[PDB]
Amino acid sequence: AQIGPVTDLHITNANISPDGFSRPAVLAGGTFPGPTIAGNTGDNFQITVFNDLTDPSMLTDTSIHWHGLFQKGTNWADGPAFVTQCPIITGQSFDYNFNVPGQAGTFWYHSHLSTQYCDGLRGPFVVYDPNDPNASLYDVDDDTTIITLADWYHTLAQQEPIGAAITADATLINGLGRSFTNTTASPLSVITVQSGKRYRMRLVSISCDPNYLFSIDGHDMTIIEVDGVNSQQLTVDQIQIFAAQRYSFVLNANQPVGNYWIRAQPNSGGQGFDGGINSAILRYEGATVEDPTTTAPTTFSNPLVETDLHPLADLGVPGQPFRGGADDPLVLNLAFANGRFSIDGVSFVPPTVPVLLQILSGAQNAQDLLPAGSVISLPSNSVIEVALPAGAAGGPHPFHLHGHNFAVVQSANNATPNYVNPIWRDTVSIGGTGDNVTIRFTTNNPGPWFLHCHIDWHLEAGFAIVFAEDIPDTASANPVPQAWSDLCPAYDQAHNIST
Ligand SMILES: *[C@@H]1O[C@H](CO)[C@@H](O[C@@H]2O[C@H](CO)[C@@H](O)[C@H](O)[C@H]2NC(C)=O)[C@H](O)[C@H]1NC(C)=O
């Protein structure tokens, strides 16, 4: 069952064996992935998070981010540790109480403390639209049509060297999959369809690092949503999905009744499908209960290309149709050396006092804010352009902005910008050497918004900056509850920190 929009959510430690190998984890709702949190557009969500963690090897503090939800007027509920809150300590709880006006689509939730989400705190978050403009394109859209893609590690995250190339041990599809080494024939996930029906498959990358080449043997996929943004219909036979991205696609169950492989090939870790790694099963009702015998093609003739995507609504692009044609045009210098990432020459290291609390306490320019050099102020009611030229080691890096979605004016592997009708999204691959992926948005949401690579090992190694949007209006726009004001005193007392 789905939970929400008003629900408790307990965060616990438990052993799990999703690939046949047992290890302890950090779990929401006792499962991997966590339960789906759901509601309708415009609903009030009140997710009371109970921190019941006791195993220090995965951190006993926590904080949860609601990925892709704008949090307008509720910046304090966004979740990134030391940007919008201090962590929740063990034995305490915290009500994330916010609203989702003007958004409907496929989202997710995850720990936003250190690399803790890698240790298991990740699940889907779906905001349905009772008047969805895409409703007539499918018959079925429910918890059974959500498909999660996850990387899974046998080593605990707090034992992963910072700045290292860290490689997973299994791909998990809907929580199940097989290990790349010492492979055992552990259970594969089954997605069941009825011949003749059409399904809204909600594809969610809950990855900490790899991108996946996702396909379904014998089937094609008609994209209708990108990171929460409704798209024109685009039919593809393969989707390369980067960490934290989401797509909805229509699956037409129009092939012969049978079993078909579902494939998710990561860019690192095990290559191919030997022993049923990187795999799940699409089973038609009435098919024999047996593994598929289907083949992938040698090459995919209609792969997703990001410039082929266009919004269903007339979203356009803010600003003027040339590079630098914005009120506040920025170019970030994105670099890596010696185990640490940097943005504009500064490697992100979380501050002692969360950025939001620094601003509420009266610090009101970005040079007064800590970490020094890690906070850029944005002016209110302005068009912002951010160029993100690639080249830093460990690519392709999927950059994500909190508090906003954005027009993708230039995409990976294509030097031509689009000022007319590009897709809008919230997480974007910045591509490869010489690319100049560029995003635009308007500043109508006061508060400090994190910008970072969504490969969680890279964030940990410093690949982040904070956009302090409309510092002067942050306090009036974001009144804070007493329980939020209580978090830093409690956290600092528990950890013997003075501030
Ligand atoms: C990416 O595009 C940005 C503009 O959006 C380019 O920025 C210019 O950089 C040159 C020096 O390299 C400066 O003289 C200009 O002031 C910048 N802004 C402009 C022209 O609008 C940036 O060079 C591009 N990067 C790559 C690698 O192509």
Ligand SMILES: *[C@@H]1O[C@H](CO)[C@@H](O[C@@H]2O[C@H](CO)[C@@H](O)[C@H](O)[C@H]2NC(C)=O)[C@H](O)[C@H]1NC(C)=O
């Ligand atoms: C590279 O990106 C550009 C810009 O998004 C793509 O150019 C568009 O191509 C479409 C489809 O043919 C045309 O309707 C638009 O007028 C083009 N816009 C511009 C600004 O040129 C281009 O197709 C992409 N290249 C590849 C190989 O997909």
Ligand SMILES: [Cu+2]
């Ligand atoms: Cu996220």
Ligand SMILES: [Cu+2]
């Ligand atoms: Cu986010």
Ligand SMILES: [Cu+2]
């Ligand atoms: Cu990265």
Ligand SMILES: [Cu+2]
């Ligand atoms: Cu973040």
Ligand code: NA
């Ligand atoms: Na425009």
